[PDB]
């Protein structure tokens, strides 16, 4: 896999490079006189880019073969005249009513054969030929019309593919899946082997016997190999649609182009790292996680985004000023979080900061979603903070932040979309264990130990790092196995955890003892698992460790430890459980490297407490200060190292005090003491320094 | 109802009778070189029977009308020559893809009309004539081919009927249900009366107006008499299918034949006692209940299996060496439980001990289900315990265990599949009360008081016992009523609980006060119920009793007690409830016997504490020992008494001390003190002795 060449949206003629600042703009939802008020307010706020026409198909093509562009010409002109750049959409995110009325075969079909209707959005099949013809047609009309518009700086292709239409079970999907399987496997016997079809009379004579994983009765168990391929296929079918639209636009109007991802700790609707290879620049939608996890999970997701972009600058396409509309309980943001959240994504390497949306809708299903201009209007704390943020971004651009990169960490935490899919089967050891939670737990625990990790997709250069975490990385292919073995052999410092390396990329178990492909590297052998929980009276729901930590949900049964290895921590338990004195945490010497195995789920807190002794043995340096977990430190720098920025975020509900090590440029809820060269950072506060 | 003559699978020429030991064997999932390792490991383990071809249809008939037997002939010859017998499947458990592609009408239909697809197993309609054709054809091909094979000791017809295909709502089912109703009732007027169809305008003019209980809207209320008959019909249709396959194998290849049941405390997909009349020997699958109930519920289930078998030896077709795959959290087994669990089924009368499965699948939906040979291979604690168990079963057969029977208890606990169905309606007094939990509660509480009960299906000879429990036995027919009355009148000691005798076998309520067919027998009259729970603030969630116990979920409102009866325990409550000082537990003198009435759910704990007084009133003797409930004592003996075995299982997490009353044969996590003639049984331990 090669990436496309990097391309970034360029300034309007006569403008200098800025951190792009703005949001989705939907003037089609407002009387025309509002657009001038919009433009005045945008200039006040320091907004310099908006994303237009994303769901405007029914206005752009109001009946088949009739096109209406004048309204959009006029808004683009207003914006451009005022010095505001337009990120223009294909307009193909969701079809108009006329089209699905005429062609119901466009509508995706669920696992039971029920047809998703219009009434919301993105109700189209990824593999519909009819819908592709309509999408490519609008793409060509749009590219033809805006080819020479100097105010349009980039293409926003469709919108968040697969958010609603990830899975289709129609005849189109059935045929496409068959062809996808022929292309991957060549022969039906290679499919029979991969999926283990000798089990339960599933063996197929030919590729026409491959059906999608449709309804099989509630609570019954689908073929796991097949269901993993179904997820890979579904991602790939949408990726092919993206490529088609992308290609139809660029053939006519070559401009920097992206499509917006949905990278967050727990969102795996697509293999976003694979998709990263086909965008010109990575753009992402991220919304805060409610409660205590808000800051850490956002910094993590932004970190992953940077990792998908291979440390190139990236584009925050969407986040919220305050509440969203789509949770059961739509918590608002607290004072300071607007500025802080935006500066967090920026610190993780974004050169653009954009919201959904500019102006809060007064009608429709997202009327309750926050905006930059709330229902309350610009006499509001939200808009004041938006303007403050505008001025902050202008300041950081002035001081040279643009094109700097997220500094390389000591530690790469590995993420694999496919490993997450493997852990989603309904007949694994426990539904309570998925891939995705572990890398996040480790990011938080390393931050508690004063270390900001990088998060690196499994295809990416994790093997170039001082230290690497494999966090519940269920899949290890032959290839990844070899990369792991050699990494350690040649000086690598590895952490491996439970639920890592169970299977290969066909979802076949590595035999002989878990983790079956790398027992030599970790220096342990696991014969079986001990899932934990509380779903009946008297189930085992925890295991204490002799290092003052407690395991929940899952523990390995380690039955041997190599001679090159030693036990760092052991379980304490009732004798009849088998776990008393059993190994929990181990470190192994392998070539010139070391590998630690963490044989149970310890959570953030457990990991955080377990880590000092492991980091010491593996030779990973951190601060000794007991306050090192209070702030998250995030650095951007150019290649020289001359333009070097440090972002410091309070992670706590206490006042955090830090050294100021340069010129302070931005201070949200932070007060510097010039003479003592110190700063007190309030809760939800941030200080930005240039070294 | 007649049972079939008992037949048991016989040894291979030249072998002595043994406790059949082994499991499901799936060579078709492995390279043929692996079969040699399998056979060597089976011999090391003392395995002497395997169950083959259960899901092998796609290999035996890889296309319509093409048969491939050679692989199977070879595997069978490898086994038989190594002294391992073969329980051969009909292969008809689940159809291959080519068959359902060609004949979609085979596929069962859910209540909403959505067709169950292939992708897991058993996706066929019980009443499909085309599927019957295919299944009988393969039966005959297999019978014709293996009728003179001397290594095939029995037939395993299909597999676990109804586990996935209990209910079908297709046109086939509709027509079959009409004919079923006409056979049972004769006239549409008799159906109308049974189902109470004057209510809600449901009266039918003819049999063509009967439809299955299909979708009526979420939360709406099906006609209860029809639903009960639907569950009766569903079990009967699968039974007719089983009999057709059976008769087709046996007309060609008369060998001993069974089909595996799923008897456990809570599983009632079929009337397994009824199905018990059509097997030659009873076989069963049972998997452990997680947590505290593991040991007790397994013993209870084994006990019920023995009851269904009418005290003939029976075949444990499946259980697990450790974790299963199909729970949300798949807990492992603790040290010693492999052996103990097997010995529990044995103590309760099994002459065969078999596992799912011999070797752990490395691919497919049950890859995480434990086995006799784990992924880790034969160098494993599981394989060592499998080998130790094999030796123990050889030892026990050498000492004369075979064909001994579970000793007749003082107490029969009555179980009625149909009564559980009656309690399943959505408009009962409370969804918290079902038939099934009460017999289990009584079994455990009787064990707390040092008595091992028998569990006897309602059709079975419970009226021959010293004492009898009717536990939430919601149906009492006229015939069962007469049997209960005559039992007590002639000297029986009866325990009757709440939710007993509400309805007849048509689900019509017995009028005049509950329980309305037997008020004279129990000497009480219930006017109404008081369900209890916590589903709004301030609901009544318990009622204390003056014997130091607490009722939950349900209490009866007893408003009169007969002159022949007296009150043993009363409720204590806030006065506004109406329950302060009301009767809770009574005893009535009726003819030469007694009937105790327990008018609330006391649970295991409350029943345990209540039982000393009740046992004394009813003249049922038990130990006086404080420690009488620490251990479950299970006994098997021949008709003479000459071979008399005692199994002693620790039920606790303490060391149980016991008296050794014969020769110790098997001691798992138990230590005999020779000279004191005592033994220390560790948690999860068991001692087996011959007197
Ligand atoms: O949070 C809601 C918001 O989510 C994403 O960013 C979408 O692309 C937007 O159109 C909107 O639906
Ligand atoms: O525990 C899993 C196991 O359950 C039963 O015993 C079935 O008959 C087997 O085929 C298998 O599915």
Numbering used by the authors:
A (entry chain E), B (entry chain C): 1 to 691
Please quote the authors directly.
As such, BiBga42A represents one of the pivotal enzymes underpinning the symbiosis between bifidobacteria and breastfed infants.
Therefore, we also replaced the acid/base catalyst Glu-160 with alanine and performed co-crystallization with LNT using the preparation (E160A/E318A double mutant). The Gal-complexed structure was determined at 1.9 Å resolution (E160A/E318A-Gal). α-Gal was also observed in the crystal structures of several other GH42 enzymes. The asymmetric unit contained six molecules (two trimers) of BiBga42A. The main chain structures of the six polypeptides (chains A-F) were virtually the same (Cα RMSD < 0.107 Å for all chain pairs), and an α-Gal molecule was similarly bound in each chain. The pyranose ring of the α-Gal adopts an undistorted 4C1 conformation, and the C6 hydroxyethyl group takes a gt conformation. The O6 atom of the sugar forms hydrogen bonds with the side chain nitrogen atoms of Trp-326 and His-369, while the axial O4 atom is recognized by Arg-121 and Glu-366. The O2 atom of the Gal makes hydrogen bonds with the side chains of Asn-159 and Asp-285. The α-anomeric O1 atom is recognized by the side chains of Asp-285 and Tyr-287 via hydrogen bonds. The side chain of Phe-356 makes a stacking interaction with the hydrophobic C4 region of the pyranose ring.
